[PDB]
Amino acid sequence: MYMKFTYHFHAYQPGDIIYVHDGSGWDPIKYSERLSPVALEIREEEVKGRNWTRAMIKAYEYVDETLRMLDEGAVSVDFEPFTLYMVLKYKPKIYGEIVETLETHVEPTVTVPFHPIMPHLSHFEQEILSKVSFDFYLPFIARKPIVSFWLPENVITKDTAKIVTSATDKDVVFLLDERQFIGVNIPQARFSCNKYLCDGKSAFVFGRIHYISDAFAFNTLDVEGLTRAVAEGCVDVFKEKEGIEYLVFLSSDLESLVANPKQLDRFLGWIDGLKKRGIEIINVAEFIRKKVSNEYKSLPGECSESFRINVKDYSSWSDYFDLSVDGRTSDMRWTGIRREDNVVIHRWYKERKVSQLWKFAFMKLFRELNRAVRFGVIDMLRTQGVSDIEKIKEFLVRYSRVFFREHYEYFELDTSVDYVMEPIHEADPSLALKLGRIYYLMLLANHSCPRFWENIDTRVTFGNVATISKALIELMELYMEENEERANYIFLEYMKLLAFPQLYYDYDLFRMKGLEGWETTEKAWFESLRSEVPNSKYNVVTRAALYVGKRDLPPDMRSVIDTLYDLEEAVPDTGHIPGEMHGKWENKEWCEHKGKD
């Protein structure tokens, strides 16, 4: 057949960090992790970990062994940077196997550190993250003129696409979902080599078919049904007769390969079924190269600016599509707000409706915390003689060589203090590297995960809050050392976490309109925040802020939280993430933390 096929897998773990340890900033962070034993079943084997992250890192080895069974160049894979870093630290043999595969066997795809929703960050943070993405991936992409790129949840806007494409000299291919395309219908654009204008430059774009991808990932079609959906359901009878190659592109989380014990064999069987139908398996970048080289035949204009299509700003690959009013995806899943009619939505959780209003407040608060940290960094570097914002940006990009030191060192890349400090070498490195650490803890705290789920009370929300609390308390303490009034500007930011439920009033959320009409009431807000664990009466945001504060706050401030709160209720226990319920957990009722050692 002239039909070509490929799959893209995206790998990411938020991690199980519950308390970051104090540190100078001269080295990668160290931390305490959740102790919540859990196991994953892969074929007939049980893979056990002290927490979800560690169980999944072991699972990645099984996934790699399976990818190695595929032919060379068949599929593409992105690994979120800190995820790959955690593999390196915990199981360097597994990291070795994965990076060998990324070097030679699958097409490596660049993605953003810490998996934030990029259009939900300020341009400054997006710029730093974009530059770091390409630096971190240098060992895998250095010689490549065209590279694919994975935006978290495929959430994209033209502005974000411009930031990403501006951060590299390479041509970029954005991997997206076909429900994101606009100005063309789905069958009209399907499977061709299309481009996308992101202002100064253009990128290639490919859009996955979600219903087939999910039929694999969630095991709703058997191998024969998957083979039929592709070989028959996606046939382009015209291109078959014209002898014009076209690409059926699908994508899922890499972790879908362990979503049940038979996934790995299902995937291999599916690929085998397609190959036997005369369908070659070829990754997106190689497909483009063959079109461009004229090894493949093209429609007139294909792979050029003549074949431009449009993408809907804020669309995604994973939105609550049952609530779509335009047949496309959006970002309502992460904001709690449907844009078309500007209403606050609800979702089901444990058979009750829960307002998603908390997601808007959480997002808005983090925009504010992010700026407080960034402006604190800029202000303190100003006191060291550093005034050029571009040199500060360069420093923050180079600081990823400290934060992910062992990865860069694995690939013989310079991580020395002299390299990192070069753009701001007038500054004292003791202060500068502490500020770099603080900035990166803030970035790490912007994981999109908490807002993916319907319920706020999860281990990822706890982690984001505990991590940003670390950064804020450290920044506050730097200002205290200067005997600065600005220390309490930062305490204000931390107080907004502790007093999270008050933000319903302070952000005027009562002015917003609910989809059904109740989602923006006080009752709906407070009900959404109720603790899901019996050993804490506090909402998860307050809970995490207290957990870190009771360890790190100066004594006077500790006495204040000791008086206002029951600090014995500041524990890391949270509700479970619905998507992790397929694991075999020691406590399957909630996400525990065993605290004896």
Which positions touch its own copies (CB under 8 A)?
Answer: 182-185, 187-189, 211, 215, 220-221, 225, 228-229, 231-233, 235-238, 241, 325-328, 368, 371-372, 375, 480, 485, 487-489, 491-493, 495-496, 498-499, 501-502, 505-506, 538, 542, 554, 556-557, 559-560, 562-565
Which residue, 69 or 325, has its beta carbon nearer to its own copies?
325
Tokens of 267: 């995937």
| Cα–Cα separations (whole angstroms), residue 254 to 57, 295, 459 | 12, 30, 21
Looking at the Cβ atoms of 69 and 492, the one nearer to its own copies is 492
Which CB sits closer to its own copies, 184 or 281? Answer: 184
Shortest gap between Cβ of 130 and its own copies (angstroms)? 22
Which CB atom, from 138 or from 564, has the smaller least distance to its own copies? Answer: 564
Question: Cβ(515)–Cβ(355) under 8 Å?
Answer: no
**CB closer to its own copies, 229 vs 337:** 229
Q: Which helix (H) or strand (E) holds 225?
A: helix 223-231
198 forms beta bridges with 200, 201
Neighbours of 203 (CB within 10 A): 21
For the bound state, the minimum distance from the C-beta of residue 285 to its own copies, rounded and expressed in Å, comes to: 26
Question: Of the two residues 113 and 207, which places its CB atom closer to its own copies in the complex?
Answer: 207
CA distances, 244 to each of 281, 286, 506 (Å):
16, 16, 59
Minimum distance from residue 2 beta carbon to its own copies (Å):
13
Burial class (CB in 10 A: 0-12, 13-18, 19+), 597: exposed
Nearest-approach distance from CB 408 to its own copies, in angstroms: 33
Smallest distance, its own copies to C-beta of residue 531, A: 11
**Rounded to the nearest whole angstrom, what is the least distance from the CB of residue 368 to its own copies in the complex?**
5
- CB closer to its own copies, 237 vs 581: 237
Closest alpha carbon to 247 in 292, 197, 208, 294: 208
* CB of 557 vs its own copies, minimal distance in Å: 6
Strand pairing category for 76-79 and 107-108: parallel
Nearer to its own copies (CB atom), residue 215 or residue 431: 215
Angle between helices 223-231 and 263-276 (to 10 degrees): 40
Q: Tokens representing 218?
A: 């969630």
Closer residue to its own copies, CB minimum distance, 420 or 545: 545
Q: What are the residue ranges of helices labelled H in 68-207?
A: 81-90, 92-104, 123-136, 138-141, 158-166, 186-189
What is the Cα–Cα distance from 106 to 353, expressed in whole angstroms? 43
Over the range 498-520, which residues count as b (16 or more CB within 10 Å of their CB) and which as e?
A: bebbebbeeeebeebebbeeebb
- Minimum separation from the CB atom of position 266 to its own copies (A): 15
> Would you list the DSSP string of 251-318?
EEEGGGGGSSTTHHHHHHHHHHHHHHTT-EE--HHHHHHHHHTTSS---TTTTSGGGB-EE-TTB-SS
Contact predicate 20/467, CB 8 Å? yes
CB 40 to its own copies: min, Å: 28
Give dist(CA 481, CA 153) in Å, integer. Answer: 41
Buried b (16+ CB within 10 A) or exposed e, 60-79: bbbbbebbeebeebbbbbbb
CB of 233 or CB of 578, closer to its own copies: 233
Closer of 24 and 185 to its own copies (Cβ): 185
Please report how close the Cβ of residue 21 comes to its own copies at its closest, in angstroms: 24
Query: Least Å distance between CB 590 and its own copies?
Result: 21
Provide, rounded to whole angstroms, the least separation between the CB of residue 371 and its own copies: 6
Q: Identify which of residues 138 and 325 has a Cβ nearer to its own copies in the complex.
A: 325
We find the least distance from the C-beta atom of residue 546 to its own copies, in angstroms, to be 10
Give the residue with the Cβ less far from its own copies, 268 or 487: 487
- b/e sequence 329-358, b meaning 16+ C-beta within 10 Å: bbbbbbbbbbeeeebbbbbebeeeebbbbb
| Smallest separation, CB 318 to its own copies (Å) | 16
Amino acid found at 561? I
Query: Would you mind telling me the total number of residues written for the chain in this entry?
Result: 597
Tokens of 457: 């009370």
Pairing relation of β-strands 31-33 and 17-20?
Answer: antiparallel
> d(Cα 394, Cα 5) in Å, to the nearest integer?
40
The residue (of 12 and 267) whose beta carbon lies closer to its own copies is 267
Nearer to its own copies, 272 or 562 (CB): 562
Taking the complex as a whole, how short is the minimal distance between the CB of residue 361 and its own copies, in angstroms?
14
